[PDB]
Amino acid sequence: MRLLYLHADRFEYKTVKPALKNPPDPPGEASFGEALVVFTTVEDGDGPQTVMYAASDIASHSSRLKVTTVILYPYAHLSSRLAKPMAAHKRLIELEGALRTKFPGHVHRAPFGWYKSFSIACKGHPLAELSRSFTE
Amino acid sequence: MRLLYLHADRFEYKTVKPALKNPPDPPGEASFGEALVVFTTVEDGDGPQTVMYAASDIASHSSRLKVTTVILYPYAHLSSRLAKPMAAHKRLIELEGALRTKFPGHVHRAPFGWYKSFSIACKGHPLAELSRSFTE
Numbered sequence A, B: 001m002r003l004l005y006l007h008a009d010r011f012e013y014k015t016v017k018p019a020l021k022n023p024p025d026p027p028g029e030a031s032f033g034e035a036l037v038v039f040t041t042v043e044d045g046d047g048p049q050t051v052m053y054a055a056s057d058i059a060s061h062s063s064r065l066k067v068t069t070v071i072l073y074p075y076a077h078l079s080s081r082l083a084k085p086m087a088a089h090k091r092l093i094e095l096e097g098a099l100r101t102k103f104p105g106h107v108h109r110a111p112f113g114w115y116k117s118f119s120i121a122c123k124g125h126p127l128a129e130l131s132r133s134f135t136e
């Protein structure tokens, strides 16, 4: 699992066209205030332990930033070892569930399988932008 | 070299604090209209051939999108095999020079060595967001 932690003053996205033949999440759109935006690439070989590591780190980083909103934003472009679409959608479902057990704020899981337009205003401070890898 | 091609309706950034002890580029800020924003991570082992590959692909992708502006945005977070700061600044200088020989539009090299705040409005269409690796 490759992740990118963007501490944003603002985030919003809208799904456009389907990217997979059968996108497992309905289309949609959302906009946010301050939020840690976690760009998430599920990698071939992520399982439950990977998920719990990532959940723990996401919650601890958020606590550091004092953020109360976390967006889990599926992203196919952070690495060159992706899990297949089905497996990836499952791990993201589990990652959302797992993060709720470690983080008291708002957790928003963005839809998986769509091309999306997004806007972000990413903060300029030293820890606004960090990358993370998790494995098992 | 790891790259991320973000086809944006809009982009802007401002440098905040220094990130290296001696940032080789002066501080600054800029804002743009439509533009391909190339998030660039220089990897340990990039040389001249890597640069020319990336320049060729950047120019050809831009031609596909019919964009006329390309931002080369140094980014330390796309991979886990970075070149050292000096080497990376050099390759980005060369990448900017090389891209001018293949792409007729505006090429903006963002400053290297700063923490930055940025805003992007990234397009929703099928090729608005692509990743690329180049090696030699």
Ligand SMILES: C[C@@H](O)[C@H](N)C(=O)N[C@H]1[C@@H](O)[C@H](n2cnc3c(N)ncnc32)O[C@@H]1CO
Pocket: A019, A020, A040, A041, A042, A043, A074, A075, A076, A077, A082, A083, A084, A085, A088, A111, A112, A113, A114, A115, A116, A117, B129
């Ligand atoms: C394209 C860009 O605008 C958008 N943001 C996008 O990347 N959409 C992805 C994810 O939502 C999802 N997806 C497929 N594989 C994966 C994976 N291994 N890990 C996470 N998501 C995946 O399916 C879409 C196409 O790959």
Ligand SMILES: C[C@@H](O)[C@H](N)C(=O)N[C@H]1[C@@H](O)[C@H](n2cnc3c(N)ncnc32)O[C@@H]1CO
Pocket: A129, B019, B020, B040, B041, B042, B043, B074, B075, B076, B077, B082, B083, B084, B085, B088, B111, B112, B113, B114, B115, B116, B117
């Ligand atoms: C932090 C985030 O807001 C900002 N956008 C940032 O990443 N700043 C980077 C690059 O500008 C540059 N830099 C250092 N190493 C590299 C490298 N190997 N490749 C490209 N740039 C590098 O030095 C800064 C700190 O790593």
